[PDB]
């Protein structure tokens, strides 16, 4: 069930309340939540 | 231990020590879905 919400979550200067993960070393289990934030090692030379 | 379904059954043992004979099956009791993985477990 989907519906657009611009009444609230798009501010005058833009919204900065919601986030997402760009690229993850491991995949995601079906129905599992990812709440772990860390500097993802894109290459070698650990961060 | 298996959405955590806890299969339970009460066994009326009457002995001193290491497992006697006699048997039953095991009935599920309650389901609380944790939603995240489990790695270990311990008894206090």
CB A25 within 8 A of CB A40: yes
Contacts of B28 (CB under 8 A, 6+ apart): B5, B6, B7, B8
Q: Give the ranges where chain B is alpha helix by DSSP (H).
A: none
Q: Which of residues 5-24 of A touch B (CB under 8 A)?
A: none
The residue whose two tokens read 């079906």 is A30
Which chain B residues have a beta carbon less than 8 Å from that of A34?
none
Q: Give the ranges where chain A is alpha helix by DSSP (H).
A: none
**How was this model experimentally determined?**
cryo-EM
CB A25 within 8 A of CB A41: yes
Q: Between the CA of residue B32 and those of A3, A42, B22, what are the distances in Å?
A: 30, 37, 31
A33–B37 CB contact, under 8 Å: no
CA atoms of A14 and A12, how far apart (whole Å): 5
Give this entry's resolution in angstroms. Answer: 3.9
Cβ count near B6 (within 10 Å):
13
């Amino acid at each position: 069930i989907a519906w657009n919400s611009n009444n609230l979550d798009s501010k005058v200067g833009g919204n900065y309340n919601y986030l997402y993960r760009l690229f993850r070393k491991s995949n995601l289990k079906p129905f599992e939540r990812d709440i772990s934030t860390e500097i993802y090692q894109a290459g070698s030379t650990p961060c | 231990f298996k959405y955590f379904k806890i299969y339970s059954k009460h066994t009326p043992i009457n002995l001193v020590r290491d497992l006697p004979q006699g048997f039953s099956a095991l009935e599920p009791l309650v389901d609380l879905p944790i939603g995240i993985n489990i790695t270990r477990f311990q008894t206090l």
